[PDB]
Every structure is written in structure tokens, then in C-alpha cells.
A paper describes a structure:
In prokaryotes, the two proteins RuvA and RuvB play critical roles in the processing of the Holliday junction by promoting the ATP-dependent unidirectional strand-exchange reaction known as active branch migration. We show that RuvB motors rotate together with the DNA substrate, which, together with a progressing nucleotide cycle, forms the mechanistic basis for DNA recombination by continuous branch migration.
The remaining seven RuvB motors can be grouped according to the number of bound RuvAD3, with one map lacking RuvAD3 (s0−A), two maps containing one RuvAD3 (s0 and s1) and four maps showing two bound RuvAD3 domains (s2, s3, s4 and s5), together suggesting a dynamic interplay between RuvAD3 and the RuvB motors. At the opposing lower side of the hexamer, cluster [D] contains either ADP (s1), fragmented and interrupted densities (s2 to s4) or ATPγS (s5). The fragmented and interrupted densities are indicative of low nucleotide occupancy, suggesting that these sites have an apo-like configuration. As a result, the binding of sensor 2 cis-Arg218 to the nucleotide is released, whereas the coordination of the Mg2+ ion through cis-Thr66 remains intact. In the next transition (s3→s4), loss of the Mg2+ ion liberates cis-Thr66, which now coordinates the ADP β-phosphate.
Author numbering:
A (entry chain G): 156 to 203
B (entry chain D): 19 to 331
C (entry chain C): 19 to 136, 141 to 331
D (entry chain E), E (entry chain B), F (entry chain F), G (entry chain A): 19 to 330
H (entry chain H): 158 to 207
The structure:
DNA sequence: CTTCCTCGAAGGTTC
DNA sequence: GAACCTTCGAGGAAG
């Protein structure tokens, strides 16, 4: 899952989030098994 | 009504209202969202309410935000996930959005997806996120500074206009029913004539006349009370304040119509240059009473016949 | 105290004073707060004074700040959090607020709530009914959206000789100086129509009477004191009289340019245009023309010369 | 995509299209890169489309960027290093990049190499990097806006221009089939005449006319239907937009044709002065409706009769 | 010392000096601070010198600063609150203070309080800071540059005037005793009449004469040495410089007295238009040698009888 | 390469070459640098090329930049610190250099030193920089636009002029020999007559004609082919560009031949004033197409008989 | 070296040298610094050179800076802190300083102190800096731009005159001795008459003639080589350029001596209206070739014999 | 030494010293020249796209 | 965003 | 009616 976890954190940074905040935002997500799309979708949704 | 649910209730703006009705119905005959729409016009005419009515006609949920509130690409992308299929997104002051976000909106508007690029060299990759269909409704005052690529995405243009006397009269009538006061139809017309075609100014006059009618009268706004109230206030039958009348009189009486410089005119009426150039002068140009020339302001024939003075070329 | 406390003490301004009484009375009768009021006009006419009078008539405590003291949105957010129902907020020199602060202020005026971002965090506030009172000399410097939010506009005007005469007599009682009815009129004529100038002349005359007289202002001491200050019966200063004289005796009344006149009197160009001419033009002693400025018939009669068209 | 892929499909621009054919094939005979080319002209005429056609005819993969996308020399040098012999680089709005970048583009275009000077104080050295042969394509809205020494490097100029009625009718007719719309040869001509020479204006009008025909008619765009729809869209028979009609009407009724200054006119109609002079006056000047004088704008006799007012 | 310290030593300015004596004496009988004083007028007439005299006669400490030094409200807020009851604050070149800073004095001068923002974040507070009674004194050469609300707050206005020959003679004789030199009464009058009415110029001429008298003479100033020293400096008995004489001569010998334009005359003397209009022309007009008219400059009869020509 | 490298290869400019030979040769017997040289004249005549020739004759390195590229004084100081003794510095477009920057050259050119403020805060200090001997070469179109302080410091002035048919014809023959191409004498003469007397244009046209002759011809340039090729392009039978045609076609129709000001004309043709003022007006004036008048420019009879109008 | 170092070497400016000698000697006897002095006049007459002579005669370390180098008050304060007792501070182009900084010198020149704001901002206060005795020397080309309060503080004013042929001839000889070239008195007088009275121009012509005389001569500047060299430079025996010669001739050949207006003549010479008035007309009037009149300008008899026409 | 040369070249192009070092430090080839390194340090940092 | 200043228009005199 | 001179007003660009 580290592959998708690293992708989701890196993609979220590309959206203008700081490297620190992106790592925390993704770490707050529960499901590890879901793909980066679901992880990035939930990260943005939870921060709204 | 003041809070309209459908075009049948929205007062005025008949041109833009008639066009949107046909486009919405044509879109409904298909399982498609309405084309991206851009609204133009001076500030204060009611663009925000117009967007709300469009959503009720389509039978859709409306999301509301503004250009300044969006600072990074992630802000916009997060909002787009909140949309259900067919939702309407309204962005005010769209010309103030930073370019870093503007370039992301192009792909979303045209394809309904966003592609995010990450990595470098041999590790370069992209992730693709689908978006549900949506209609972006933009509103702006300064249409002339939008980039050409952005203007090319919008498919419908609507122009708002100042209200006319037959419609601005109805806003006064309807507003008079929110308070508890009776107003004669002949009096409602007198307030509309002086409201400069703007609903905000019509409300202000009604409030000031209301206070007078319940302290200097029997609590009813008849033509006799309106005449007195509009006499305590300086506003003339054309909507000119006291200071507006003093400017026109001075130009005709002391300079013979001009040309006269801004500084020379300011010291005669005892006002700051900024006050005459921004508060009073803009409306006199729209009304056609003065012109600005390389050598100074000049009064027009329309101004002479309104103040009641003889005119000669 | 020098500043009037109630409308019964506020001499003059019958137009603004009459309108404010109607709007204040109607608001009380409905138990509502007063609409937002903007006060503007020339210096020294009574704008700051009227702000305190409004509060004393409404029976509320006035919160006071100034434009130059507000530098960031966080400052205004702190101030507004202290308001209670019916409070009146007065902002002097409102034209100095930064553009980023104006956008916050005019939102609260319409919807009575604030929703702003301030390591960044959001701030949200719900505001009780309140009245904002602004005073400024440069109303045209305010943004068009903000000016539209104000519901009352008060434009101040210059005073008349009967009104200024009463002010001079009133202030004389605070200094407990005795002054005669005809002597008070001599200070009114020279006060250029402004209360602050009337108070200034009274102070300078009082100081003379305490040293060169018997400590009483009378028709004879006033004439001597005004001769020392060298203020003409029309209020013209020594330099103002020198301008008209030079125009009539060296250029036959004009036209003459601003540069030529300034160099001939040994004065700076910017001082003549911005400090001395404005009063001469409003009283009708000088005219501006496409080719220069000329002295009017009123100037010839006052200086004592034979007019020639 | 709607845009064509080859010169056989590309409608109009016969002059530019004929010249580029000769210059492209001549380069093949010598087996060398095509000379640097500059495309200029009004917006929406097909400049971006043409850039892809050139690459397809040459048989190369196009690389694309824009003026505001490049901000430091390292950006351009990185892009230039990732090139293959014969690659074509397209830079839109070439006139907007910073001059600090132009200093490097000169030697890249003319010398095919760069020499990075490095050192501090008394020290100074340089390293030269070889660049594979490439062809630069630039595009702008005006020719003179481009930096004078940079303009001298472009060896081929391509002046784009407005389409004529035959070419626009062929475009209008084609696009209608994509929407599954039935349009007669007469109706397609009315829309063409009023699109004022711009292909995307014609396409935008067609999409809007379709909606009206599907409701106020039987789904067939007839001459009788198109004329009613175009008056509903408030588009004049000369292609004057809503704002264009407002300008002329105000000059005639409120100022007797002028002269009038831009400040007065831009304040009477609620518009920004930067909008009037940039978006609308250019068309009214070329079409001869308004003329510029030191005293202000004036409405010509043609404008008077078109709007329908008794001339002096 | 070179600057007087009390009204007994301050020669001239009778009008301004008379007023200040009455107001200062009255303020002492009431035991209260003096009202705010603004001093303005031409350069070198005694504005700064009078500011020190006021403090010495009031018998209080003088705090000094200047307009160019203050740049932000924080600087002024630090000068304030350092004041003690009865202190005098003197600001020189007050016209340089930024407009955003002058608006801080509006409350201080009228009500002796200012509004300050204090604390941080949620603890931010607006508090009244209250000042003891004090007297502001300002000196400026450009009074018309101050905002109208500020000039209205000053309670005493002093406008300086040029000095007469009797007063300047006494000033020369006084200064001649600070240095160690004997000067004949008839020689001091000769320097005073050439000093254009300004004390600083009278001191400058004396300093230049001293250098000559001790190098080319016996160390004493007498009519014979003064005439020689004044011949080296080439200053006319009316104070006209070398270039001032050249202007009048050219106007009388080439243009017959005028009218002549500023440009035509400048080129004939090899000067430049800005030097003639700002350095030389002002004194010639104020002394009646030249008259400005719509057609050009004209030389008056007074100039003819001075240069020795015939007023034909 | 095309660009000449020695005076024996530089065609024309006989009046300038003769002077530069003597000064360069005299500067070689003595061990010193060449005096600062200013080159001015119409664009495209070969003044940048002349700078390379000078450097090659002197045998030193050449550094190149432009006025508009230098934004602040610190930029020029960094550049001057990068020159070794005897190097040549070439600055193009020097008339648009900012005033704040030009003020630095006055001391550098006369004495090779600069007064600069270095450090910040408490570390701020004045330093007296010293520069090695160097020769500045400046190029400008508007010699009369330079300030009197700068123009007086250049020691050599070179005026450059349009090339005549015997010179341009030789340049075409030379260029057509670097490429492996063959041109007949009649074709080279006609191609020069069409080239506005400007080498930059003659070289650009020759390349395009060569492409046409290779694909649409027999690989050899003949008068018949050159006439056809130059007719496929917009080059008129006497070198008028399409812009030249629009100017002449406008003056006669919109203004009845004039007189008309160049300012209003520029905005009516949608062109930048500088381009028409510096690149087009000089040629049309020196060739009798446009003539100057107090009220403005007027079209001559030669223009009417060229565009086919009647000189009524 | 080229620049003189002592009064014994400085030719001309007798009026200024005579005065400066007395004031320097008197200052030494008193053991005091020299009064502040302002040097002004036309360009290239020796102002910058004279400032160094003063320092050598006083015998002190000259500290140098420039007007445009001082960007803000912080820079000027740093410079003043470095002064030692008796140091001379020289500021060339003193008119380029900003007004906000020029007003800081007012206190430094009269009272030798500066008011400075110090402290972190939480705690801050004004303090008096006390400067040692020093001499300020200023040089400017246009004193009319300095504010009246600044010009009044300078105690010694020096106005530079143009040089006469006797004095200017000695400068040409002296300069040849440095180049080791032999020059005959007959030729030195020819160079002087063409130097327009300016030393900078005389040195420039001598350099160009020296180069020519050694490349195609015997290494002697004889009366014949000088004339040949000057013929190549195109300098008339009165110093007129070809542009000036065209003007004087045109007035005679097309207008019979005038009167003609400036706008009419400008067209006949293809010269910009303001250039002719600012660049070329001044010297022609000062030499007496042209005369201004109420109806235009007229070519005098002197201009007739110089061109050889028949005066009538 | 070519590492510092490569870093010095990348500094001139506007890259900060930290990134230029990090960029160049990612590359390693003892026989590479500063010129061949430069052409790799940039190629390794540009995002290739298809 | 602001202060200075330069470029242009036109009124009036005279030949 | 061609040429000089003075005066005012609105932009724009350098802080
Ligand atoms: N058709 C209308 N009917 C009733 N009130 C209106 C109408 N149009 C505008 N108004 C009033 O004028 C104001 C419009 O504000 P808003 O809709 O925010 O303007 P905009 O969105 O154009 O900035 C509101 O006070 C609104 O009640
Ligand atoms: Mg107040
Ligand atoms: Mg002083
Ligand atoms: Mg010098």
C-alpha cells in the first residue's frame, strides 16, 4: 500500500499542499488498501 | 416577489430571461447539463439572485463561492467533488482568480476530468480523476480582462440592464408590503423616477419617506406626503442632489458653459477634486448633461433646457 | 464644555439638524437601531461634534476608533467583537482604511456577520444590531460599494453672521470674559464662516485685553486688538490685501498668470494657489479665466479705487 | 477533433497554405530542418491548428508550451535539452516571455548552441552545450509587439487573415453534420455572412441556433427559422453584437456623431475603457463604421445609414 | 554666539516680536502652556532662531527633531509619550511628514489623546493614550504643502518679513564683534546695502571681506579696503551680480528694452532657461528693474538710470 | 560563414572603413585600446557586423548586450567587472537605456572608476571601484536622441548609409556562392533592385527564391524564375512591402492625400509608431513617395501613378 | 598627466583662481577648514578637475562620491560617519540627489549634526550625531535645480567661463608634450579656433590628428597635415558641421536671408523641430551667424562671407 | 571537481544551491564530464510527458 | 498608489 | 496669415 500512499501524498502536494500537511492529511485516512484515487478523493473531501 | 423561485416571479431583465428560458428547455429535452454561462453588467443589479433562479428551473442543487476565496488548485478540486451530477457552480468576481487555478479549470470545463502530473524523468506519471457533469456560471464586472482561453469556454453571454420605470415601480410597491405601509400608485411612481434605475436606491428613498410619514403625518404615503418628504430632501424630479444642481448652475452662470478645468470648478463649490470626479460627475455623464474634453468640461444643450436657461451656440 | 452636548445646544446646521431629529425620533418609536450615517464636508464645521451628540440623544455609549489606527483585518475583527446591542461605532478619518479592510467592513454592515480567514485559521462572528457612524473630508475617496451601504448622508455647510455671533457669546461665558453685543459681531464678520476661527480670534483678543487693557472686551479694545493682528473687516490677511493691490496697480486688474503674480509678491507658487486664493475666489474678489485671473468690481470697491470696465 | 489534420483538410488560407507547402517539401529534398517560422494575426483564425499540420507534414512529434509557462533560463534550457533532431517547438504568445529568457533564445535559434558563462569577481569561464537541430514556431496577435532583434531571427512570416463567404459556408455545413443537424445551403449562408469572418464565432452561433430550432420549430434549420433565431440572439445582419449597437446608437443620438472622447463614451455606457479600445473598436474601424481623429471618434456616413437615421 | 538667545538681542521682526511678547506674558499669568505656533516665510530670515528664543523665554526644555527623520507612525508615537508637562516639541521642515502620519496629530493637538492598537491576536485592544499639556512648534518654507485640517489647528501664525538697512547695519556691527575685527560705521553700511535684505547674506559678505582684509591688508576693515574687496567679488553697489549686469546690458543694447522672450535672452547670454528664471530673474523683478508683460520682459527707467544709458 | 570577418571582406561603407583602418592601425603601433566609437544609422545596414570586424582586427574578445536588457545600475556594474583588459563591449539600442543606468557610464568612460554603495544596514559603505582599459562600442538609430553628456564622451562617430546597386549586387553574388547555388547575372541584378538597398532583406529573399527554384524550377535561378518567385511573395516590382502598400493606400483614400500627421496614421493602420517612423518612413521619404510639410506628410504624384489612382 | 594638479598648471579661469587663492591662504593662517564651495557652469570647462586642485592645495585626503549613487538617507548618514577632521567631501552632479535626502544636509552644513531615529521599534528615540569640521564641495551643470535653502548655504560660488584663443592655444601645446608629438605654433592656433572654446573638444581633435599624422605622415603636426586631417573629419575652419553649413546655406539660397520661421526651415533640412533649436542653433547665434527677430531669424552678413555668396 | 562545475552551471541558470547540489548529487558517473553531467542533471529533473 | 512634470492646445499681439 | 509668446489642462511615469 506504500506505493499508493506515496502517490496520494505526492499528488496532493502537486495540488499546492505543503509536504508536511499532505503527509498528515493522508495519514488521517483509514482505509490503506484503497487505490490512490480513492485516497486522494477522501483526503480532499475530508478537508472540506 | 422579492425572493423569486422561478422566472415567472422574477421582475425585469426580460431580454436575458427570455433567452435563458429557451436554452434551459432545449437542454431538458436531453439528458445534458446547461452550457457554461457568463453574466455581464454593472454592480448591484441582481446577478446573484439570477443564478439561484436558474438552479430552480433546472431542478438542481446550487453551490456558491467567490474568486478571491480560492487560493490554490486543491481548493477548487475539492469543491468539484461536492457536486452531484448536473449541479451548478456559481463563481463571483471570476476575473480575480489566480492563474495557478485558472489553468486547471480549462480541462475540467471542456472534458469533465482533471489530470495531475507527478514525478520526474523516468518516474513521470499522471493520475486521472473523472468529474460529474456540471454547469459553471460566472459573473464579472470587468469582462475586458478575462484571458482569451477562458472566454472561449463560455458558450452563453447574458447582459444585465438598469431597470425601467414600469418595473422599478413594482419593486417599490412590493417592498412597501414588507413594512406595514400603504402607498398610493401615483406616489410609487415619484419614488421610482428618482431612484436612478437602481433597486438599492429605491429602498433607501422608501425608508427615508417612511420615517417622515409616521412623524410628520398620519402614517400613510399619499401624494401630498411624498411631495413634502421629497422637499425636505434635496432630490429633484430628475434625481439630482443639491450639489449636482450647484455644479450645473455654476458652469452656466460663471463660465458660459465652459470649457472649465477640474481644479477651477472644485474651488468654486468648495469640494475636493476626488469628490466631484467620483461622486457627482459620473452620473451627469450618463444622464447626458456634461462632456469631458481635452480642454475641460462643457455643458450640453440638454443641460441648458433642464435648468431653464436660454441656449446659444 | 466647549463641545455642545445636545441638539438644544447645537447652533446652526438647520438642514442636517432638522433631518437627524426626524430619523432619530422614528427609530426610537419602533425600538430599532438607527441607520448607518455618513458625515462629510469642509474642515471645522462640526462633524466630530455631531457624532457625540447623536449618541447622547439615542442614549447609548459611543465606541471610538480612527482609520489610521486600523492596519489589518485582525484589528477590526477584534474591535467588532466588543459591540453590544444598540452600540454605536464611530470611525474618524474613515478614508484611510486599507482596501482589504473595507471589504470586510461593508460585508458586516449588510449581513451582520463576519466570515474571514486569519498557521492560517478561519474566524466567524455573528453581530448584534449596531449603528456605524463615519466622518470624513474626502468622501470621494471611499469605494462605490461602501458608500452605497450608508442610509443617511450629512453634508455640512458654512454658518451665517447671526449664528456665529451667538457662538462667540457662548464661548465668552466659558472663559468668563465679559463681551458686548456689538463687539461680538466684529469677531463674527472676520471668522470666515467657521466656528474654529471664531474661537481662535476670541482667544487672541482675550490675551491682549489681559495685558494691554482692563481685562474686559469692549468695542474699543476689540478695535485695537484687531489692528494689531492686522485682520481687515472683510477678514482679509495682510498677504491677501497685498495680492489685490498688486493686481490693480501693476497689471490694471489683469489678466495675469499664477507664476507672474507669485514672483512679484515674493511668495511660493504652491502657497498662493492652495492657501490664499481659495477664499478670494469664493467671496468673489477674483475670477479664473482661460488666459489668467482678473479682479472683479467688488475688489475695486473694497480697496478704494475707481473701477474701469 | 473538429480541427483538420492535413493541408488537404485545412480550409482557407490559400496563400499561407500554398507557401508552406513549397518551403516544407524543399527542406525534405535537402534533408534538413525547416527554418524558424512566425505566425501572426487576429485571434481564432487557426494559428494553433496550423502548427499541428506543419508537424504532421514534416513527420515529427510536436512539443508545446507557452510564454507564461517559462519563467527562468533553466526552464527553456531543460526543454531544449529534451529534443530530438527535427523536433518542432511551438511557443504561444512568444512576445510575453521575460527578456532574461530572450538573451538565451538568440544563440539557440542562430547558433544551435549555448555557452553558460560562470564565475565570480575576477573569475569568469564558460561551458558550451550542443543543441540538436530544431525548428521554432511562434505565434502572436501583433507583429510589432515582438522584440525587434528577436523578430529578425524568424526567416518565414505567415500572415493569417479573415475567411471569405465560400470558405465559411463549407465550415458551417460540415460542423452541422457532427450535430446530426439538417441545414439548407441558404441558411448556412446567412449564418456565415453574420459570423464576421471568425470560425469559432460561426460554431458558437450554430450551437445556439440549434436550440431554437428544436423548440420553436421542427428540428430543421430553415432560412425562415435562422432569421428569427438570429434576431432573438440580438445579432445584427452585419454581425454587430449587442455592445457594438450600443456604441453607435449612443454616438448618433447623444452626440450627433461626435467627435467624442473615449472617456466620455466609456462612462456613458457602463464599460471599462480598456475593454472598448481592445475588444470592440478594432472591428468597427476596419469595417469603416468609426474613424479616429485627434478630437475623438466620429460616426461615418455608412454607420448613419446602416443604423437607420437621417443624415445631415 | 552667532544666534541671539533673548528678545533683547533679536533685532527686527517688530511685528512678529511684538505679538509673541504679549501672548507669552499672558500665558504666564494664567500659568498654562503656550498655544501652538507655526513659523513660515522666505529662507534665512530667522525662523529657526526664533524657535530657540521662544523656549528660553518660556523657561522650559526644548525637544528637537525634523520632518525628514520621521517616516512612520511608530516613530512619532515614540516621540510622543516622552513628553513632560509643559514640554516644547519643535519640528523643523514639518512639510515633509507623510500625510498618513500628520493625521495622527489631529487628535493630539486638539484633545491631547491618541488611539493606539495594543496586544496581539484575540488580546488586541484599542486604548486611549493621554498626553500632558505641551506646545508644538513648526517651521517651514512651504506652508501651502500642509493639509488644510492641520493648518487649521495651529493657533499662532508668524509670517517673516525682510529687514531694512538700519537693522542690517546693526547686525553687521554685532557680528563683527564675535570675530575680532574693527569695522568703520560707514563701511558696515556699505555691506548692508548689498546684502539683499537677508541676514545670512550680510554675514557671508563680511566673512569674505575678512579673508581679504587680513591677507591683502593690515587686518582692519576701512572704506579703502572695503571698496577693493568688493571689486574682487564684483558686486554692484545695488547688489547685482556679474550675470545680473550682463542681462540688463543685453536687453538695453540689443533689443532696445524689449519686449523679449525668456528663451531668446537666455541663448544670447549662453545661460540656460532654468538658471535665469529661478536664480537671477526673481530679484530683478522684486527690485523693479524688470517688468513682466504678455509680450515679454521689458526694462524699466530705473534700469536705464543705473547702467548710465539714455531713456529715449 | 556569411558574416564577414575582415575589412577585405566587408563590402561598401568606404567612408567608414577608411577612417577605422587608420585609427585601428595607429592604435596598434602604440600599445593602447581604441577610442570609444558610436555607430548610428538606419537598421539592418550592418553595424553589428562592424563590431565583430573591429574586434578581429584588434585581436581581442567581444562581449555583447543591449540597453533594454539592463534594468538597474547593479546590472551594469556586474557586467563591467566581467571585462578583461582590452576587451570590447557592444551595447545596442543604447538610446533606450534608463536614465538611472546611463548616469553610471559617465565616470566609467572618462576615468575607469565607479562610486558604489555596498553592504546593507550597519555594513553600508562607499567603495571606489577601478576598471581595466576597455573600448565601448554603442549603436543607435536616433543619434539626435542621445543626451549631451553622453554624446560628448564618444571619440569616434560613424554614419552608415544605404548600399547602391553595384554593392548589393556583389553581396548577392557572394551569398549565392556560400550556398552551393548558381545565379545568372540578370537575376542577381533584379533581386537586388527589389531589396530596398538593405542587406538583411537581400539575404532573406535569396533563401526563399532558392527554395522555389529547387521545387518549382530546374534548380537554377533565372530572371523568369526570380520574377515569378518574387511575385508569389508580396514583394512589389519595386520592393514595396504589404505594409508600405497599406500606408500609401490609406493616405490617399482616408485623408485625400494629406497633409496628415504620422501619429494618427499609425493608429489607423494598426501599427506601432516606432516601426513606421524608423523602418518605413525613411525609405519612402528618400525615394520620393512621401514628402514633408509643416502640417504633416503628403503623398506625391509618384505614389498616385504607382497605385493607379488619378492625381485630381 | 592630462588633469592639472596645482594652480601653476591650471591655465585660465583667472577670476576663479584669483579668488580661491586668497580664501585658501586665509583659511590656513587661521588653521580652519575652507568654507563650503559650489562650482557650476557649462559642460567640460574644468569643474571636476578644479575640485582635485583644491584638495592638493589644502593638502588633505579627498573623499569622493556622486549624486546618483546616494539612493536614500541611510546611505548619506553612513558616508558622514566616516569623516575625519578637515576631510573634504566632494559630490559631483549634486543636483541628482532626491529631495528627501537633500533636506538632510541643511543641519549638517550649518550645525554639524544629524537627527537620527534608532531602536528596534518597540523602544526607539531620536539622537544627535555630532560631525567633525569638514568642507563640502559640490559641482553641477544646472544650479537652477537646487533648492533655494541649499544654494544659500554654500559660502563660495565659482562660475566657469569659456576660454579665449590665447589661453586655449597653450592647452593644445601642453597636451602635445605629453604625447611627445611635435606641433608647430601655426598649427596649434588652427586647432584652437576650431575647438569651440572647450578644452574637451580641443583634446579630442588633437588625438585624431595625431593618429593621422603618424600613419600617413612623418610624425610632425605641420600646418599642412593638420588641414588635410581636418578635411577628413569634416570640420570647417569655424567649427561648423555639415548640418550647420546646410542650415546657413539654405537660408540664403531659398529665402534670401529670411526672415523664416523655425517650422518652415526645419522641413527644408529634414531636421526635427526641437533638435535644431536645442542642438545647432545655440552656437550659430553666439558666433553671430544667425540673429533672432520678432518675425523670424535672419542670416547676418558674417554668414554671407563665410559661404562666399554676394551680400546685398 | 566536475560536480562543483555542474553545480556552478546550474546555479547560473537560476537553480538554488540546495537544489542544484541535490540535483547533481542524484547523478553519479566518475568518467562523466561537467557538460555531460549538466545534460543529465536537467534531464533527470524535467517531467517527461506523453 | 502617488507627485511631479512634459507635452499639447489656443488665445492674443504684431507685421 | 505667418510667426512669437504666454497660459492652462490633462496624462503618465518615477518614485
Ligand atoms: N428583481 C429583483 N427583485 C427584487 N429585488 C432585487 C431584484 N434585483 C435586485 N434586487 C435587490 O438588489 C440587491 C441585489 O444584490 P445582489 O443580487 O447581490 O446583486 P449582484 O448579485 O448583481 O451583485 C438586493 O438587495 C436585492 O434584494
Ligand atoms: Mg474632527
Ligand atoms: Mg532653519
Ligand atoms: Mg565634469
Amino acid at each position: 500500500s506504500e506505493d499508493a500512499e506515496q502517490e496520494a501524498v505526492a499528488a496532493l502536494v502537486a495540488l499546492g499542499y505543503k509536504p508536511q500537511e499532505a503527509s498528515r492529511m493522508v495519514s488521517k485516512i483509514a482505509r490503506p488498501d484503497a487505490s490512490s484515487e480513492t485516497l486522494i478523493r477522501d483526503a480532499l473531501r475530508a478537508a472540506l | 416577489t422579492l425572493r423569486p423561485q422561478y422566472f415567472k416571479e422574477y421582475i425585469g431583465q426580460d431580454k436575458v430571461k427570455d433567452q435563458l428560458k429557451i436554452f434551459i428547455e432545449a437542454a431538458k429535452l436531453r439528458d445534458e447539463a446547461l452550457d457554461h454561462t457568463l453574466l455581464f453588467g454593472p454592480p448591484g443589479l441582481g446577478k446573484t439572485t439570477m443564478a439561484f433562479v436558474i438552479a430552480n428551473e433546472m431542478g438542481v442543487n446550487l453551490k456558491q463561492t467567490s474568486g478571491p476565496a480560492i487560493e490554490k488548485a486543491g481548493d477548487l478540486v475539492a469543491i468539484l467533488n461536492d457536486l452531484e451530477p448536473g449541479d451548478i457552480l456559481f463563481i463571483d468576481e471570476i476575473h480575480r482568480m489566480p492563474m495557478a487555478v485558472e489553468e486547471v479549470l480549462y480541462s475540467a470545463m471542456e472534458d469533465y476530468y482533471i489530470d495531475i502530473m507527478i514525478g520526474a524523468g523516468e518516474t513521470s506519471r499522471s493520475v486521472h480523476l473523472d468529474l460529474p457533469p456540471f454547469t459553471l456560471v460566472g459573473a464579472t464586472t470587468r469582462a475586458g480582462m478575462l484571458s482569451n482561453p477562458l472566454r472561449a469556454r463560455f458558450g452563453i453571454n447574458g447582459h444585465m440592464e438598469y431597470y425601467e420605470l414600469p418595473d422599478l415601480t413594482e419593486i417599490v410597491e412590493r417592498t412597501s408590503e414588507i413594512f406595514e405601509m400603504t402607498i398610493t400608485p401615483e406616489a410609487a411612481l415619484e419614488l421610482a423616477r428618482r431612484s436612478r434605475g437602481t433597486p438599492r436606491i429605491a429602498n433607501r428613498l422608501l425608508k427615508r419617506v417612511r420615517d417622515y410619514a409616521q412623524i410628520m403625518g398620519d402614517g400613510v404615503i399619499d401624494d401630498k406626503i411624498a411631495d413634502q418628504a421629497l422637499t425636505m430632501l434635496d432630490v429633484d424630479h430628475e434625481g439630482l442632489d443639491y450639489v449636482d444642481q450647484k455644479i450645473l448652475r455654476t458652469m452656466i452662470e460663471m463660465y458660459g458653459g465652459g470649457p472649465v478645468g477640474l481644479g477651477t470648478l472644485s474651488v468654486n463649490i468648495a469640494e475636493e477634486r476626488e469628490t466631484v470626479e467620483d461622486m457627482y460627475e459620473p452620473y451627469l455623464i450618463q444622464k447626458g448633461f456634461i462632456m469631458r474634453t481635452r480642454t475641460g468640461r462643457v455643458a450640453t444643450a440638454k443641460a441648458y433646457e433642464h435648468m431653464g436657461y436660454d441656449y446659444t451656440r
